[PDB]
Each structure stands twice: as structure tokens, then as C-alpha cells.
Paper text:
Sortilin can trigger internalization of ligands from the cell surface via endocytosis and sorts ligands between several intracellular compartments, such as the trans-Golgi network (TGN), endosomes, lysosomes, and the secretory pathway. Sortilin binds and sorts a broad range of ligands, and dysfunction of sortilin has been linked to a wide range of disorders. Previously solved crystal structures of s-sortilin revealed that the Vps10p domain in fact consists of three domains; a ten-bladed β-propeller and two 10CC domains (10CC-a and 10CC-b) that have substantial interactions with the β-propeller. In this study, we detail that sortilin undergoes a conformational change within the three luminal domains and dimerizes while transitioning from neutral to acidic pH.
Residue numbers in the entry:
A (entry chain B), B (entry chain A): 53 to 54, 58 to 287, 290 to 311, 314 to 416, 420 to 557, 561 to 713
Write the structure that this text describes.
Amino acid sequence: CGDFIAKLTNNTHQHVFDDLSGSVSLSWVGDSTGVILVLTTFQVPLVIVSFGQSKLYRSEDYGKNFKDITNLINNTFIRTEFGMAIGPENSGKVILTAEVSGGSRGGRVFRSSDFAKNFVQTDLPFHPLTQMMYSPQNSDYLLALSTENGLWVSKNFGEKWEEIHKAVCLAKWGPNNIIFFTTHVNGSCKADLGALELWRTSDLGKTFKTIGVKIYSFGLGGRFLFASVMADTTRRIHVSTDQGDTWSMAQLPSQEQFYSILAANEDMVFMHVDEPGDTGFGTIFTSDDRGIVYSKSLDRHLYTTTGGETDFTNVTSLRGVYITSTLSEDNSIQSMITFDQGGRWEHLRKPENSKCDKNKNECSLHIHASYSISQKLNVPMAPLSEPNAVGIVIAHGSVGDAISVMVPDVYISDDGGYSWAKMLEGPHYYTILDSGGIIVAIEHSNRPINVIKFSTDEGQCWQSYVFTQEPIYFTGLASEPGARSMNISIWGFTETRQWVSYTVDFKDILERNCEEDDYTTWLAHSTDPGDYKDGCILGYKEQFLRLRKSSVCQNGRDYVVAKQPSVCPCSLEDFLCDFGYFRPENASECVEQPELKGHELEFCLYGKEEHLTTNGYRKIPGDKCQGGMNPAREVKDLKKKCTSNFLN
Amino acid sequence: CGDFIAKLTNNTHQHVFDDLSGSVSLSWVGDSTGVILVLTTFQVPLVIVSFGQSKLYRSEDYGKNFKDITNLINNTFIRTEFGMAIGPENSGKVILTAEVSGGSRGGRVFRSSDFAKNFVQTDLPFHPLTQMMYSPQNSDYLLALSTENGLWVSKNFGEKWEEIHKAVCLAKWGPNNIIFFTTHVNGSCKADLGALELWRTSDLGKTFKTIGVKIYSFGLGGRFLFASVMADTTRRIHVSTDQGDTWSMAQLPSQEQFYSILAANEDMVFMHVDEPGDTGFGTIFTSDDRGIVYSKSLDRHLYTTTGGETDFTNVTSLRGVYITSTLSEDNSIQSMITFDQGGRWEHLRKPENSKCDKNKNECSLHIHASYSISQKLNVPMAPLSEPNAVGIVIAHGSVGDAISVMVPDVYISDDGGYSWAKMLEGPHYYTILDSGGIIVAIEHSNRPINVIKFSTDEGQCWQSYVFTQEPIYFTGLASEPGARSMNISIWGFTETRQWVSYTVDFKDILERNCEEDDYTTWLAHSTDPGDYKDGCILGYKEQFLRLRKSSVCQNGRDYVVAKQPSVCPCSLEDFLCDFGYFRPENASECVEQPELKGHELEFCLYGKEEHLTTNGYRKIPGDKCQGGMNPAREVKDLKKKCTSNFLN
Ligand SMILES: *[C@@H]1O[C@H](CO)[C@@H](O[C@@H]2O[C@H](CO)[C@@H](O[C@@H]3O[C@H](CO)[C@@H](O)[C@H](O)[C@@H]3O)[C@H](O)[C@H]2NC(C)=O)[C@H](O)[C@H]1NC(C)=O
Ligand SMILES: *[C@@H]1O[C@H](CO)[C@@H](O[C@@H]2O[C@H](CO)[C@@H](O[C@@H]3O[C@H](CO)[C@@H](O)[C@H](O)[C@@H]3O)[C@H](O)[C@H]2NC(C)=O)[C@H](O)[C@H]1NC(C)=O
Ligand SMILES: *[C@@H]1O[C@H](CO)[C@@H](O[C@@H]2O[C@H](CO)[C@@H](O[C@@H]3O[C@H](CO)[C@@H](O)[C@H](O)[C@@H]3O)[C@H](O)[C@H]2NC(C)=O)[C@H](O)[C@H]1NC(C)=O
Ligand SMILES: *[C@@H]1O[C@H](CO)[C@@H](O[C@@H]2O[C@H](CO)[C@@H](O[C@@H]3O[C@H](CO)[C@@H](O)[C@H](O)[C@@H]3O)[C@H](O)[C@H]2NC(C)=O)[C@H](O)[C@H]1NC(C)=O
Ligand SMILES: *[C@@H]1O[C@H](CO)[C@@H](O)[C@H](O)[C@H]1NC(C)=O
Ligand SMILES: *[C@@H]1O[C@H](CO)[C@@H](O)[C@H](O)[C@H]1NC(C)=O
């Protein structure tokens, strides 16, 4: 790689908080408002009334000075489990949900509509079981669940509440202020698992519509509405794209299996299926634009026995990139990555400049996510990435040795995960701001720390800055919202403990705007060899930018050239495997599954028996390729009517 | 209350361990053998083959010096989940279960029959899924479950392994070397919940017997065998006292409720039943000497929604004493204690000399146990008691303030939980040795520590001793086994971390034997007023001893006078409430349940319809009172045969 102190010392702002008990929370509120709220919270069970008092501080000068405003919430306290209830980014809505320290017949909330500058008190006609839920369509609409399983809505932002149903088990918002929720009759929700009923409301609670029966669970994802249904006993999954008017059971090749949705968009659906026997690993399947017909996409996917957590991450810094973790035939764990939205996975390339090279399964990079947390491994954070920071991925990774599993390191990718480099030794808390101009990490240890590690050139070069002469036990790291933000907030405590917050500003470090000479063009990776598809991602070609090495300048432009997307010709990577086909390890072409050979491929689609005839290729939902490779397929109707639905 | 340093500094033995990875475990092996093992373990998923090496140190001088014996276990490693497998106290058996560092087709064990002084290496014909399991009747027999759900046994202390059944979900030893397990057929055990089968072997695996069908789960306790059965769907609990030859369904007063067993011994059985509605509280029922006929004992019993953990605790330091935590009418958590084996519960007396006196529910002592851990409160250890140390109880407690909940304190009872006293500020790890003569505790914090707190007068006076000028981060505290043990072991590390263990010996502190002038007589508490039953516990009267205040002497005698138990006359406290009756709050007499008044009390006992007629009193199983109060009851047979069994 290859003065910076005075730039940060003049912009390091400290503030000490005295006599704080319990857990300490800190949240910037909105973009470029200077509002930071610090909140004391306490771990108290939900059905218990306890005596306690939450301290509440508000800054309006970007972490310089804080004003105690606890008088606003006198005689109340905030559960850690709840915390704050911030709304959308530019909505200025902030709710604080609390309980009356003496106890009351109802909860008490503090609603702000001006980025926490002025609050009004409103007492609740119930005890809230779960936090407030904003409608994504309308910040003024709110709902939450009572401790008596009652569903409460407000049309005027928590001022006037109305109870709309009394037997509710779960409730989640939908598009256009539609609310879905399960209900029952006999006893408890835990008792009537498999006999619930799924309802829908288009009128905030005026009218209802029962969309389903014999329900075990439900959930949302992208343009899909999911519901697990029990026929008696066995359990099967159904999907609807029309907010529950019409359903169809999901169709898989190859009983008594357990299902799990991994993600979903406006395009497709990732579903994981445990291998019979509950062996510890399963199979991922991918759906079409309707989310009905599923095909094998990745074998031997690890999941935690208790919980089902998986290393599956949606890499936000590159479209159509997902990384997960799988079990090799030698029973060594491997990180897999797809660049074509689950069309074809590839082993994660070992990191350059780290020649481990003994055993072959050894020295492979494993990236740590939700499975690795679940196995109680020393991983402070999941893989982090921001949409604005194209190509930048930061995560925790390990070599094939049990010593490196106990002490993971921080790796950085600049190309959506194609190439990796160990950048920090040992675990760290990281965050991304400035649209990727600034990368800040902070060591995670049992000893007090006082070292900020940051990076201005997309993680390629790092530098350390001691922000205080008094090391503090680390507690939290918050970044200011905004694409061009340069303000962070670190808080912790000393040793009766004394909390303290430092607001560091990178204004004087990044004062010069970057010119075109500080950027360097680079294309995304394409699994298909040759230049003819170099940079093609689901049929679109886009050129990218990147900060040079040791670049210390403020970016004002987006990393996409925004010239024009040129359409690429269709190739293998632009197609998923069809129903009954899969791609074997390291392989590029799809082949029929062994157990289905010589048998007629049949499935059931919206109460119809359908016969499939393919070359084994299905266009990727969302792929925009044209011309080139064009594998055919046909879906003809049959005679039988079949039964593809277990609800009405 | 009202020199001690030289007595401990000369007896503090430090040993430094260099270059250790992973978790560190430390254990004494046997009574007065001076064998201490130290083991390195690693957090690796069970299904993964990883490369690793577990370090292993033996001391045979009670902690003074340790010999690295890792070469005994070269090229293997031990999982943290497995740790050691120590047999019975005086058996001398030690197993070390490990996996081959490269991966293998079996595990590999290291067996020792001589208090860990010599080990033999044996390879397993299977990957162990669960740790080894000794038979309580014969320490030579072991058994274990393989990763392929294979049940394996050994009649010759893990030397020769034999697979006796291949579809085993769970298996558990029994009296006289009998083995219980569950089997299935279709798919996984997770898929055959409610369709399992319960089997039994008296011949270590030669002969089998299917004792129950349609099984959900099962367990052992005291002289009872339990088994949750599914009817279709609904779930009911069955009990058998004859190792599974004849069963009966449990009989409760007052559908689709969730059952749980709390404890059970050679006399009676404690059951918890979630209130319909999964409201976060339930109701405790006790049985008779046959484990069938249940009767309300404590209402509004708190349980954790996810997992069902409760605060129930068996004060093994006093016969007939148990403590748990209930939800008052004021939604405040309260500790409730019984001194008559669940016959009549009483609020836990607030501590003296701590005149908190604001609110009535406030200043109530809440004792933290399993429910409080489930709720993730800052509680390092549960209540601790030793049957050798009569009356001694130590645990973690709180006032009704949310601040005090966050930082619990440690309280002490010398009278079996009748009276309590705040003795230490803040959470601590604590432990008991010398049969109550020495009580040691260690601060629980983020900062490294170097201070031991100990007490030589059964918790009444305390004293600190700084055992090292090099503070260390705390990890573990172990005592030497024995009735008169005086050696402890403290281990932790500095900051690449460096582990270190200190063996402190209280020989020079307790050199003078206690005479009779150092003891003071005291009787146990009896709920019934008056002296005529003062000291009566389930019909037996026994006088107790106690060390005076500020007593620093070595006890050589047991705290029970062992004169002779005099039988007490029967009173209320010596009777449980009958079927359909209960004792209300603060109340002494049993009354019929409201919903059963005017209705004929009927239940079903071993396929018989039985009609009950009582005054509402049932002799306590194990109560030895004679004469005095004698409430009658009658159980007459009827005409109907009824159906009290779902397993054939
Ligand atoms: C990131 O941090 C910088 C601080 O280095 C923030 O800049 C601060 O912006 C406020 C806006 O209120 C400045 O206060 C005043 O704004 C009024 C607007 O009428 C203006 O007339 C005054 O002259 C003054 O600028 C504040 O001075 C400025 N900070 C410093 C240290 O000067 C910035 O807003 C933060 N967040 C981002 C970039 O979103
Ligand atoms: C998986 O991650 C990718 C990026 O990692 C996510 O892709 C992003 O999806 C969102 C919503 O589909 C897109 O937002 C867009 O907002 C504009 C605002 O005007 C709107 O007009 C568009 O209709 C769309 O909603 C976003 O552009 C897109 N990212 C990129 C790079 O294009 C994806 O949603 C994540 N989850 C999946 C695939 O389920
Ligand atoms: C832990 O406590 C024990 C007592 O509970 C201390 O006892 C030590 O025991 C050993 C024997 O294992 C004594 O050594 C000798 O035993 C032989 C017989 O084999 C005998 O002929 C000798 O006369 C002698 O007794 C040793 O003396 C004894 N230690 C002391 C200080 O007397 C043990 O020392 C305690 N742990 C620590 C770390 O001090
Ligand atoms: C609460 O703790 C007490 C501690 O005593 C539990 O144990 C019961 O204790 C007595 C005395 O130790 C046991 O005596 C038995 O002695 C015979 C021979 O004299 C022996 O064969 C037995 O194996 C046993 O040691 C009694 O059986 C024991 N209960 C059990 C589980 O065996 C009491 O069980 C605990 N609370 C409950 C109600 O579970
Ligand atoms: C696939 O390629 C990887 C290296 O990229 C190699 O370790 C593995 O053995 C190959 N597997 C097969 C089945 O070809
Ligand atoms: C029971 O006694 C406790 C104090 O031991 C008291 O606080 C409570 O109000 C009493 N309740 C009833 C119903 O008598």
C-alpha cells in the first residue's frame, strides 16, 4: 500500500453517559438530521410487571452533545426485545413501545413524526405481544398483536387503535395495506398447529376473506404467499401470487420431508428440503416465474438440526450472486457460489496471496454465515454488503484446519465474491457507508479496545486509528444513514460501568473529490469461458468501476457506468435445470435424475395433470438473454384432473 | 463477625499451560487419588471431518505439576459436546471419546479403569452420536448411539462393542442392567413422532420385548417409567412401575394440554401442565405412591414458552423441601416454597436486615433457577445444595426492581430455605466441599479477576484471598471429590491466550478440629404452628447441627445428631390434597375444586372405573406420621371397565 491522525482527532467527538443500567442501544434517526437516540433497555419477561426506568438521550448535532430527555418517558421502561420501532427511511416515524413501571391495563407508546425531535404520548388499550408493524405501503398504518392474541390496527399512526380479531396467532403485512393472519378456535395456537385458518383483509379490518384451512404455518417472500398445510399426517407447501385467491401445491421431483424457504423475489423462489433421516444436510431447489415447479440446484446443503439455519447469503453487491456452504463427499465443508442465480454453483476460489496448499480439501476458503453462527463458532457477523458498494463483500472465513475454525479472519471481495483476500486477522465488527468509500472494522475480543480499523479504497488498504486514550469494552457500532454519509458512532463502557460514545467524522480524511483517474474499470465474472460472454449477468452486460489501490478520495458518482445494457447471447449459465434434471459437481450441462429415467415426467399445475418433455433446460426467471443457445421444452395437458390444493 | 493470608499463599499451586487452543476442561478423577486431567476440546459440527489435535495433561500431585500426555491421544481430537465420560465415583472408570484427526470409519476411545492413571486405545466400529453411558448397576457395561442410529453395548468396559438394534431413536439404561429404547420403520424419527415403539432388553441385547406403541417420547424417574402416547390427534401420559409390564394413563382433574414431568423418586411424582392458552404459566400436580392419581398442588406455575423450563428445585440439603416461581394475581413473579414434599406452598420470606419495605410485591425475594436462565437473565449458576451439608443452600436472587434483576445478588440459607440473607453483591460462581465446611465463590464479570471469596462457617462470615498478582479471565472452578475434601482448582487465562490453573488448599486454614462448643442445635421448620410438631418433616423428628458464627475449624462429624427419629402425630402438613381438591393461597386446609362440585369424582385406575369419596386429604407418600389427625377416604370399584391404556 503506502498525517491522517490530526484529521480524525479534530473530528472525534466524545460524550460520556453516567448511571446507566441494563443494555444500551444507539440509533441514528434518518439522513443528515444529526439525530441520534441512545436508549437504556432491560431484560424482563413479557408476562411480568417489574419496576424500572429507561434513560433516553437525544442528539441533534451528529454525536457532539446529548440532551437527557428521560422526563419524556417518566415512570416507564423499554424491553430490550422491543427496542425502538423506526419506520421507513424518509418517513420520520419513530415509535417507542414501553410498559408502565408500576404496571397498567395497557401499554404506553411514544410516537414521533419528525425524526425524534418532538414526541406525543398515547396510551395503548392492550399489552403488545410483538413490536409495532408498519405497513410498507402506508407509514400511517400500524398493527401489532396483544398478549391475549388480539390483532390491533391504527389508521392514524398509533393515535386511534381498533381491535379487529381476537384469536390471532401471527399477522404480517402485505402489499397495498393487505393484512394476512392465522386464527383458531380450540385452546392455544401451539395446540391447533395444522388446523389453523389463514385470513386476508383489504380494508384495514372492515372486510375479511378466509383464504385457507388446515394451516401449519405461513410466510411471505417476494411476490409469493406461502402456507404449510397438513393433509391429516404429512406436511406440504402451497404458493399463491394473487394474495391468496388461488393456490397450488409446490411440485418437486423425488415424502414426510421438511420444507423451508430461503429467499424469494419478483422472479423465483429458493427452497431447501431436508434429506430424509434428518441427516444434517439437504437439497436446494429453484422455481420458475410462478413459483410452482422446482428443480434440483444444489446438493448436500448444510443446515442446523436445531433451527434449520443455513449459510445461504444473498450477496447484495452483485445481482444474481449467492454464496452458501455445503458438505463434500469427504465430509469437509465447502463454500459454494453461484453467479447465475442458482443456475450453476462453483467451489469458492481459494484466496490469492495465501498459499496454504498436505491435503486438497484443506486450504479451501469457507465463508461463515447463519449456519456457522448456529454451530456456536466464533463469528461476530454475517457476510456484509451494500447495493451501492458494487463488488464489495466483507465476511469471515477460515482454512480447513480446526485452529482456523476457532479464530476466523476477515476477507474482502471486490468482484462479488469471485476473488478473496484475507484483510484482517481475527474476528471483527464491520460496517459499510459512503456507498463503499469507507469500510470500518473493530476487533472483537474480551479485552477493551480503542482501535478503529478503516479503509477508503474498497477494503484493499487498511489503516488503524486510536480514537481514545481509555480502552472501552465494545458494545455497538452504528452508521449514519445516507449514501454519502461519513459519520460513525461507537459506544461501550469502562469496568459499576460508565458508558461512553465517540462520533468519528471522516470529513477531513476524504476532502478531495475523486477524479476519473482514481477509478479502474472491471467486468463481472461469467461462468462460461470466452470473451463473448465476458461480463454477462442473466443476459445483461454492464461495466463497473472500482477505486484504485491506496485511494483516499470522496466518491460522488455511482460505481455502474450507466452507459447502456447490451443484451448477451444465451448460453448454459442463462438456464436452470428443468424438472427432474440437475448439474453434477464442477459440471456445466444438466442431466436427467437417475431415479426418473425411463419414467414419464409428470407433475400437477393448478389442478391439471401436466406432461413435460425437455432437453433439460429452463430459462432463468429474470434472464434477459436473446438469441444464441435455445434449448426447447414443452408442457402439454393430459386427461386427469389431479388434486393440487388442500385448502379453500 | 471478626493472618489467613500466610495459610493460603503457602498452599496456592500455580501451573502454566502453554499453547492451548479451543475449550479447556479440568476434572478431578476419584476420591483422594490426586488425579487431575486437563482436556482441550473443539467446537466442530458432528457430521464434519476436520483436522485437529486435543491437548491432554495429567497431574497426579493434586495440581502441583502436570505432565503433557497428548502423545497418548495423538492424531485425534475431542469435541466440546462430548468432554469426558467418568463412571461412578468409586469405579475408577474413565472414557475419552474422540474422532480421528484425518477422519475415519469409526471413532476411537481411550479407556481407563484405574482413575485415569493408564489408558488403553480402542477403536470403535461406529461414529458415536452421543457420549458413552454407564450402567448404574454395573460400571463395566456401557452403551452408545451411533451416527447411523445404531445402538451399541459393551459388557467388557468398551473393549468389545456389539450392535443390538439399528433403528434406535433414543436409549436409556435402567435398574439391574435393563435397557429401554425407541425404534421405528418409515423414514426418520422426526417423521414418526407419535408412531414410535417402545422396547426393552434384560439380556444386554439378546432378548427384546415391545412394551408400547404409538409413542411420542419417554423417560425414567424414581421407580416410575413414563411415556407420552398419541391417541390418533391428542397426547396423554402413561406410567408404569413394573419396568413396563402393565401401564396406566395418568389421572388429572379438569384437553389438548401440554404435559411435563418435574421430578420423581421412590415415593411420588411432580407434574406440570400448561394452562390451556399457552399463557406462560401452568399448574403442578403430585401423585401417590403408584404415580397415577394426581391432585392440584400449585397454580400459576411459570414456564418458558419455548422449551418449558421452570424454576422447580430440589433442596437436597433438606428432606422434603422444594422451591419454584409462580405468577401472582398482580403479574409479579414470586418464589414459593414447600417443606412437606409439595403438600402446602408458602411465599418465600423476605430477607432480614434488608428492610427494603413503596410496594408490597416489591422487596420480595425471587430465586433464580432454570426459568430465569431460559429468560436470559444474568444468572451464572442455579441453586446449589449437598445432602452432606444439611440445611445449606446458596443461589442467586433479586428484589422486585428491574435494576436488581439485571445484577442479581447471592443469598444463603442455613435452614433449608426458611430464612435467607444477602451475602454477596453481584453474580458469582460458587461451590461446596468438605460437606458444608468450606464454601468458595468467584466474581462473574468481564474483567479479569484474582480474588477468591471463601467461608468457613457455612456461609455466615466471608473473607477474600488474592491468590495471584496476575489477574486472569475466569473459566472454571472444580473441587476435589470427597466427604472431607479441602482442595479446589481455579483455571482461566491471560489475554494468543495463556491458560493457567491454581490449586488452593485449605489445610492450613482448617487445622483445628471442631469441638462440641463450636456447634449449635437447630430444628427444621414446620408449617403447623406450635411446638408439638416443631421439627417434624413428613412424620419424623430429627435434631440438626450448625457451625457458630465466625467458626474456623475442620468438621469431622455429620450435621445430623443421629440419636433416633421420634414419630410425630399427623397434622395438615402431613397430607396432600386429594383428587379434585386444592389448597388456596396462604391456606392450610384443602377444598373441593369449584368446577367439580355436585359432580361425582370418577377416574380410571388400571382398566377400572373408580369412585372417590374423601374429606379431601391424602397421606403424603413417604410420610411416617402416626396417630393425630386422620382424615378418611374410600376408593370403591364400579361397573364400567373403561379404557386407561393406549399402548399394547
Ligand atoms: C456527516 O457529518 C458531518 C459532520 O462532519 C455532517 O455535517 C454537518 O451538517 C450540519 C447540518 O445541519 C451542519 O450544521 C449547520 O447546517 C446549517 C444549515 O442551515 C448551516 O447553515 C451551518 O453553516 C452548519 O453547516 C454541521 O456544521 C455539519 N458538521 C460539521 C462538523 O460542520 C453531515 O451532515 C453528516 N451526515 C451526512 C453527510 O449525511
Ligand atoms: C437479492 O439481492 C439482490 C441484490 O443483492 C436484490 O436485487 C434488488 O431487488 C430490488 C427489489 O427487487 C431492486 O429494487 C428496485 O427498486 C426500484 C426503485 O425505483 C424499483 O423500480 C425496482 O422495481 C426494484 O424494486 C434492486 O434494483 C435489485 N438490485 C439490483 C442490483 O438490481 C434482490 O431483491 C434480493 N432478493 C431476491 C432476489 O429475492
Ligand atoms: C489435597 O488434599 C490432600 C488431603 O486431602 C493432600 O494430601 C497429600 O496426600 C499425599 C498422598 O497421596 C501425601 O503424601 C504421602 O503419602 C504417603 C503414602 O502413599 C505417606 O507414606 C507419606 O507420609 C505422605 O503422607 C501428602 O503428604 C499429602 N499432602 C500434604 C500437604 O500433606 C494434598 O496435598 C492436597 N493438595 C494439594 C495441592 O496440596
Ligand atoms: C431430592 O433429593 C433427595 C436426596 O435424598 C432425593 O433422593 C432420595 O434420597 C434418598 C436418600 O439419599 C435415596 O435413598 C435410597 O437408598 C437406597 C438404599 O438405602 C438405595 O438403593 C437407593 O438407590 C437410594 O440411594 C432415594 O432413593 C432418593 N431418590 C432417588 C431418586 O432414588 C429425592 O429423590 C429428590 N427429589 C425427588 C422427589 O426426586
Ligand atoms: C471439482 O473441482 C475441485 C477443484 O475445483 C476438485 O477439488 C474436485 O475434486 C472436483 N470434483 C469432481 C467430482 O470433479
Ligand atoms: C398472602 O400472603 C402474602 C404475604 O405472605 C400477601 O402479600 C398476600 O396478599 C396474601 N394473599 C391472600 C389472598 O391472602
